[PDB]
Design a protein around this ligand. Structure first.
Ligand code: FAD
Ligand code: FAD
Ligand code: ATP
Ligand code: ATP
Ligand code: 60G
Ligand code: 60G
Ligand code: TPP
Ligand code: TPP
Ligand code: MG
Ligand code: MG
Ligand code: MG
Lengths: 255, 607, 245, 604, 49
């Protein structure tokens, strides 16, 4: 008698040449983005019209502001504003001196070239019906603007005749695919340190708070499932102090 | 260590320690057989003036002799044998003493500790072998533990219900010399439980005594079911008399309970059970209250457990009677029969602690009416002798009973196992405690002679009679010469029926007289006794019975008496099978004649 | 003998005193009540906007508790969450006032719908305790009371370096347990402080900030309020068995 | 596959049928109240003969004498309680000597088990330490299966005792269902495909063994009882001994396996073995152990056992080869170099082809014959007007019995008489020496003689017994008459326990502690049992008595008064190696004879 | 409790038991329509990539 057979996979192995050839090929590109964005922090006296006065100044001088958020500290008549700019140091420093000179502000700090904890908040509603349904759902709302009918039939019929479209799947399999997608998204947001705050028959809402470079990656990974609705904040920050060991700080070779 | 340390044994070898420990434990006699692995011990007890020594021809004799010593003296029987074959030959006495509750401390030799589990010469797992048939056993791993284990052995063998213990003694342990101070005082785990629950237990037993006395005073047809437990105390029998006289309670005894009650007393129900009298059996069945004192409800006693004591059982369901059990071990409480009142501890102690609670009674006319009616209607009947007939076995016991009694001596009776054992229990009048020594629990053949020898050592000036059977005697007859060497003037009576009577009785009754290998070839006992160095007397004719019995007892020194008795005579009454105690099979002169002619027909005249 | 053990002997309530406690502690309102309204604006991301909506709401003296401009992942489309308070007809005027603006697609009212309101808060929070915090505040407030503060038992001064070390981590744990219970996290730990992070309801954010308040809050920053409606679903058996028609 | 030929039979009746199936022709037993259903079934059974002893221990010892003389299992049918505990010693004895035996003990009903019943003993729990395997038959359905398992285990691998407990209700029960009789042994179920890999291992072990034998220059065949458990055992041992010219020394239980009238015979090894064999072992470069387990009575001081063998092993030119049936006894005492698992006889045939024939071992046998003609079994022979010497009695009888032309079987007790009957008796035939060696039980001689006489009714069974040993079980003297066994009992009466007294005279300053029992009148005793009693106490009376003794047509007892306090020599005791023996010297004995009289006050 | 549990599904386990059962039962090629039935099952490893 023979032992129960097993189809051996035999996963192929790298050699020294193809491995290096792979790593070199998978190399990105240095300085694909220009000078790193600058972050400013305004300490503003909370008096009526400050939000219009600050943001109005940047718009009156054509400063390319990426984001501006006003935060309420736990101090009476004191607010904190976090601004993100782009441009050379000479232009952005001027922007700092232009805002700081305003009356209702105390001081505008420059957080660029400084160790800070950048944070951002996002809440997104994600579809559980899959890719095919998201193409159907999105194209449906586009016809409310495109004003086309006979030409769009080539698209919607092509979509609804796909294999994993809910219309072509039994009611039991759609249910599993909803929770399979749900488990994927839940595992995806948990790794990013997020939460699933809402679950429905057709969708779910995820909540995540991290740095902008972290959230954008998150929204790119969740994107294929279909983002039905998204709310992404600006950017706030809190300064951090880089701790170093007593042996590392003892290296005061300033000779 | 914090306990006491003794230095009296420093410088002594393991064997020389053993010699001292015998005097420290008050040992008068040691029964044993020398051997290789036990040589260091024997070298140390050489001509020892601390105790005498009895040398058998077989180790099984040494064990049985030790049992006879313990049953008669009340002291632990010490056995000193070697490893291997010497230790495997004392298994039967140990198993026998384990069931009848006889205090033994068996000292077996052992190969050196550096040879254990090497299939060594004369090596046996004596501890493992004797584990089930001993109260406790141990192998002494070092000289330091030797006096400790010995004290543990003697304490266990005498604590609670007495029994046999085994102490395995390696040669290198008994040969090595002690060099360091050692602990000696015992600390048994069982004593740690009693010390923690002393006040609670001592009050619990008193509460049971109160409830017992209330039920006893309430009883109107009581029966004292007395066992061997009342004999394990000096003031045992006398408190039994006191309780029996105070409340006018009739007393029945087990086989091992015989001697604990004067059978000349009008309240004596005599022996009950399988071959017990009908009077005692019917009394137990009709009693409303059974007071079990030092008994364990053996299956040879209760007969059919389902039919056992119907009246006493229903009286318990009415709150007017039941069963009261005086036990020393909780193991034997509610094991065979359900007990309404359990009194734990020494029976004699508890009885003397209940006397002040028992209401005095002078007359039980209704209850003693049936008892005295049964005594006259159902006596120990048998086919008595006729002119020109073979000697009857029951008659010999009755005659020897009055002959031995008319000497004025202290008579001790040991028996073998079989029909002769029962007839010696039925037709012998027991009055004195520790005078009847028999193997009942295990029923070992070849017990008669060696037990008689050992009992004779305990009581040198006592008349020790061995009522043995021909088949039983042919188990350890080698000890006849041992009796001469030991200087024991034992009296051997062999009721020779040239058959295995007890087995033939069951074959005659339950197997249609198909006698299978129950007739052994007996030797000339008279020539045997003389070859061993004893006096031999044979009685063939009925007329010579009286004249020889007188000579048998009057003879100074060891003497063997063979009495050719009638064959194929069943012991009656008999409670066997699914029969209750009230369903006994009594004697019938016509039936025996019918069975006689039927036996000749099936056996072709051979029997 | 007796192994000694102090009897705490915990007292028990009766039917009367138990009620007397509940009656005494149960919350109560106050004079001139106030309720919260939430609006959601869908605007086009043209130059300005932020100054337009804020200006329109300030030029009419509305309450305005927060604004918070949120970015949708859609080209040239922003989203704002305005928190208001006042009579239902008053805040309705505000809604129609903003919707009239040309870059505003629509303004939705989320005050009467099951929504998810979240607010980000980042606090620094000292580890040195109340005594040091009283010292630090008075130091930047620019006598005799300074000496009394530094003469308190659990100030870092007149206290062994070992107990200060443990009190640092003791406070660090107590803060950590609070953040954990509220579903937050400690993102930074220094030798004197620990930056915490929390995203929850404003009514819960203020609750956390009040509980961690005694530890001494060095820095703080509350985002505002972001709102996203729950996907309409609450009951299973009352979906078609309402019979309200 | 269910048997149905026992349906309607009682457990006892099934037992009776199983005996014929197991080719049993003799049963040794004693009745009882729990084994009654079995005895009622075997009543007048024409399927096998019955032998009734006077003691159960006798039955056990008779079964061993039957087993060792016939090669068939000894069957014991005793009762419960004391009837079972009395067979413990012969079971422990058979467990040591590896004797095929199936002991059926009775038992109380299953309804009474665990209630401290009448005549109830934990026979399974007791005999567990001294049996290969025991079992309590739970139901009549399992009875034919258990009996089949018993006989198989008792005869497989190394033979030994097994115990089968038979409850009263079980043997009385009537079988009313089809039953399995096929055994399902776990150790036997291991052989699925492992048999191949193991069969290659033993064959390669043979190859390495055959190579080492051909390389040896001073080899010694160390032979035990394992070569006797096969019919072609003694035959193949001679074939190899002639082929490679290898000298043969045997253990006490190995006696009879090799012709001692052969020039290559080394006689007995061990404690009381001749110096020729001991020195041969101590100076051998290769030791070929065939059917022996290196007992402590044989190896002497284990530290000094065969230095030349170990030294040759470290140089890759010799060592110790072990032919053993059970791996349990391999590398247990001494570290072997080559292990040949399995039947010794079977493997000797497979190796015989790979052995290079040797013409002669000149310098090796020259040194052996030197020892052989320098260290005989010397002892203080008789002088004019002296007492009869025990060694001389063995000498004369060894020739008288040989002159009969009859097949002679010799059984002994335990002690000095046992050793002298092994040294001075010349052994040539297999299965003719039956003695208790492993456990050394006294009172073994007489019952084993009776049992062997049953196995071989034509043979001249002679019991060379001692006075102390005979007193152990002389009750079976009457059993010999009833069994119709014309056994010949020889008692070397020195009126002492010689083997113990010797150790007391040598190591305990002649302090004889309770080693002198009171013997009966052996001649009056013998005739009381139904035998003929013969006694000789004079030298010129011995030869005539030894002939009347043997030529007696029936059971007979001959007591020979022998000299007292005569030590068995040579003797390897204490920390002495086999080469550090203590040989006989006329002056040494003559001095201690004078030293003893002073220390004992002329008493001994 | 400690148990080693297969991950190849029921089909392989049903196959595994049959292989070790025919190694102790008989040396003959019995149960041919069992090994052939257990194999060629839909979710037996030998039929899956
Ligand atoms: C052939 C034959 C036939 C027999 N037939 C009968 C028969 O018909 N009738 C009969 O009675 N026997 C008969 N026997 C014996 C029977 O099998 C038992 O051995 C007998 O019942 C034992 O008596 P016992 O139980 O009273 O004593 P034991 O068996 O010794 O029991 C003693 C009990 O009392 C307890 N005990 C011990 N010491 C003390 C103490 N100091 N204080 C308190 N409690 C203690 C013990 O724990 C134990 O439970 C027969 C024996 C043989 C061989
Ligand atoms: C007083 C006294 C003194 C003694 N002194 C001596 C002495 O001086 N010299 C001496 O030799 N003995 C002596 N003995 C006996 C000694 O104690 C042992 O019993 C003896 O060594 C046993 O011989 P044995 O080992 O060869 O056989 P066993 O003990 O029976 O061992 C046989 C070995 O071979 C194996 N075997 C069994 N059958 C087979 C088979 N078919 N195929 C392969 N292997 C098998 C077995 O597993 C076992 O390991 C004495 C005994 C007594 C009572
Ligand atoms: N469709 C749903 N309906 C109700 N509850 C849900 C739904 N989906 C998820 N939940 C649960 O709601 C939880 C989120 O509520 P959360 O813990 O944030 O309290 P909350 O902010 O006070 O919400 P709310 O103000 O509505 O009471 C999820 O963790 C999840 O356990
Ligand atoms: N004083 C500290 N310095 C550096 N790291 C710290 C310090 N204290 C804590 N950490 C670690 O930093 C972790 C913060 O992880 P986080 O997700 O914020 O990384 P991040 O968003 O990429 O920010 P950064 O770029 O500063 O590392 C803490 O969970 C903690 O494990
Ligand atoms: C009995 O020997 C042992 O217990 C024993 C067992 C295994 C290993 C070592 C020993 C101790 S011993 O070798 O020194 N022998 C001994 O003490 N006594 C001794 N007495 C004999 O005559 C009664 C005969 C005899 O063996 C032939 N041995
Ligand atoms: C031996 O009895 C049992 O094994 C036994 C043990 C406990 C409970 C029941 C039994 C079976 S039994 O009561 O029915 N007795 C029996 O079968 N035979 C029987 N034979 C006797 O004479 C040899 C004598 C005798 O006891 C006095 N018993
Ligand atoms: C060692 C042993 N084997 C078997 C028994 C079972 N048995 C009990 S009595 C008896 C027959 C003995 O009868 P006997 O000793 O002659 O006395 P009898 O009944 O003839 O008077 C037997 C074999 C036993 N008790 N002990
Ligand atoms: C049952 C038993 N007890 C003790 C021993 C230890 N032992 C061995 S030989 C012997 C003395 C026997 O001497 P004997 O049988 O007369 O033969 P002898 O040496 O005197 O010739 C003893 C007690 C034993 N082997 N078996
Ligand atoms: Mg009799
Ligand atoms: Mg909630
Ligand atoms: Mg002797």
């Amino acid at each position: 008698a023979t032992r129960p057979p097993l189809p051996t996979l035999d996963t192929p192995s790298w050699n020294a040449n193809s491995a290096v050839s792979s790593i070199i090929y998978e190399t990105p590109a240095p300085s694909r983005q220009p000078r790193k964005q600058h972050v400013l922090n305004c300490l503003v006296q909370n008096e009526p019209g400050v939000l219009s006065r600050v943001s109005g100044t940047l718009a009156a001088r054509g400063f390319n502001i990426d984001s501006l958020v006003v935060c309420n500290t736990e101090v009476k008549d004191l607010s904190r504003m976090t601004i993100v700019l782009q441009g050379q140091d000479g232009v952005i420093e001027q922007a700092r001196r232009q805002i700081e000179d305003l009356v209702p502000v105390y001081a505008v700090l420059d957080y660029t070239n400084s160790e800070i904890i950048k944070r951002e908040l996002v809440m997104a509603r994600i579809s559980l019906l899959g890719t095919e349904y998201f193409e159907d759902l999105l194209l449906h709302h586009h016809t409310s603007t495109n004003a086309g009918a006979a030409d769009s039939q080539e698209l919607v019929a092509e979509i609804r005749e796909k294999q994993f479209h809910p219309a072509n799947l039994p009611a039991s399999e759609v249910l599993r695919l909803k929770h399979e997608h749900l488990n994927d998204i839940t595992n995806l947001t948990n790794n990013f340190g997020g939460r699933v705050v809402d679950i429905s028959e057709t969708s779910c809402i995820v909540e995540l708070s991290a740095k902008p470079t972290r959230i954008s990656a998150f929204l790119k990974l969740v994107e294929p499932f279909g983002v039905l609705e998204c709310a992404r904040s600006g950017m706030m920050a809190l300064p951090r102090t880089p701790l170093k060991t007593s042996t590392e700080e003892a290296a005061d070779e300033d000779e | 260590a914090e306990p006491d340390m003794d230095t009296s044994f420093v410088g002594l070898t393991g064997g020389q320690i053993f010699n001292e420990m015998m005097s420290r434990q008050n040992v008068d006699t040691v029964f044993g057989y020398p051997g290789g692995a036990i040589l260091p011990v024997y070298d140390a007890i050489h001509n020892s003036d601390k105790f005498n020594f009895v040398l058998p021809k077989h180790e099984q004799g040494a064990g049985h002799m030790a049992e006879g010593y313990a049953r008669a003296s009340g002291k632990p029987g010490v056995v000193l044998v070697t490893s291997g074959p010497g230790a495997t030959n004392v298994v039967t006495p140990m198993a026998d003493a384990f069931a009848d509750g006889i205090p033994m401390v068996v000292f077996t030799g052992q190969v050196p500790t550096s040879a254990i589990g090497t299939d060594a010469f004369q090596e046996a797992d004596v501890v493992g072998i004797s584990r089930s048939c001993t109260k406790w056993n141990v192998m002494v791993k070092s000289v330091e533990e030797l006096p400790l284990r010995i004290n543990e052995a003697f304490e266990i063998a005498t604590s609670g219900r007495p029994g046999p213990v085994l102490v395995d003694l390696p040669k290198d342990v008994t040969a090595a010399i002690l060099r360091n101070p050692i602990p000696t005082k015992t600390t048994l785990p069982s004593n740690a439980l009693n010390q923690l629950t002393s006040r609670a237990q001592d009050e619990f037993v008193m509460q049971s005594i109160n409830k017992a006395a209330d039920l006893i005073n309430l009883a109107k047809k009581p029966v004292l079911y007395v066992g061997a437990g009342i004999l394990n105390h000096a003031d045992g029998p006398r408190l039994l008399k006191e309780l029996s006289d105070r409340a006018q309670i009739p007393v029945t005894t087990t086989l091992q309970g015989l001697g604990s009650f004067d059978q000349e007393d009008p309240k004596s129900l005599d022996m009950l059970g399988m071959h017990g009298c009908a009077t005692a059996n019917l009394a137990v069945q009709n009693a409303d209250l059974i007071i079990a004192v030092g008994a364990r409800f053996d299956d040879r006693v209760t007969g059919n457990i389902s039919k056992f004591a119907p009246e006493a059982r229903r009286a318990a369901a009415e709150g007017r009677g039941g069963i009261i059990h005086f036990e020393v071990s909780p193991k034997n409480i509610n094991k065979v029969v359900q007990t309404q009142i359990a009194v734990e501890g020494d029976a004699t102690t508890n009885l003397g602690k209940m006397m002040s609670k028992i209401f005095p009674v002078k007359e039980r006319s209704e209850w003693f009416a049936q008892i005295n009616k049964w005594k006259k209607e159902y006596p120990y009947a048998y086919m008595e002798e006729t002119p020109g007939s073979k000697i009857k076995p029951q008659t010999v016991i009755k005659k020897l009973s009055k002959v031995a009694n008319d000497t004025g001596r202290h008579v001790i009776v040991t028996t073998g196992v079989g029909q002769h054992q029962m007839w010696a229990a039925q037709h012998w009048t027991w009055r004195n405690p520790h005078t009847f020594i028999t193997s009942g629990g295990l029923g070992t053949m070849g017990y008669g002679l060696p037990a008689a020898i050992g009992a004779q050592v305990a009581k040198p000036e006592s008349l020790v009679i061995d009522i043995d059977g021909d088949a039983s005697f042919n188990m350890t007859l080698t000890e006849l010469s041992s009796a001469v060497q030991a200087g024991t003037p034992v009296k051997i009576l062999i009721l020779n029926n040239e058959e295995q009577g007890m087995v033939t009785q069951w074959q005659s009754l339950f197997y249609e007289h198909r006698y299978s290998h129950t007739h052994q070839l007996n030797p000339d006992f008279i020539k045997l006794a003389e070859a061993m160095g004893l006096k031999g007397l044979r009685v063939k004719k009925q007329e010579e019975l009286d004249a020889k019995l007188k000579e048998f007892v009057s003879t100074k020194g060891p003497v063997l008496l063979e009495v050719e008795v009638d064959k194929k005579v069943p012991v009656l009454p008999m409670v066997a099978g699914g029969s209750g105690l009230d369903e006994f099979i009594n004697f019938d002169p016509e039936v025996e004649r019918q069975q006689t002619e039927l036996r000749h027909k099936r056996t072709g005249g051979k029997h």
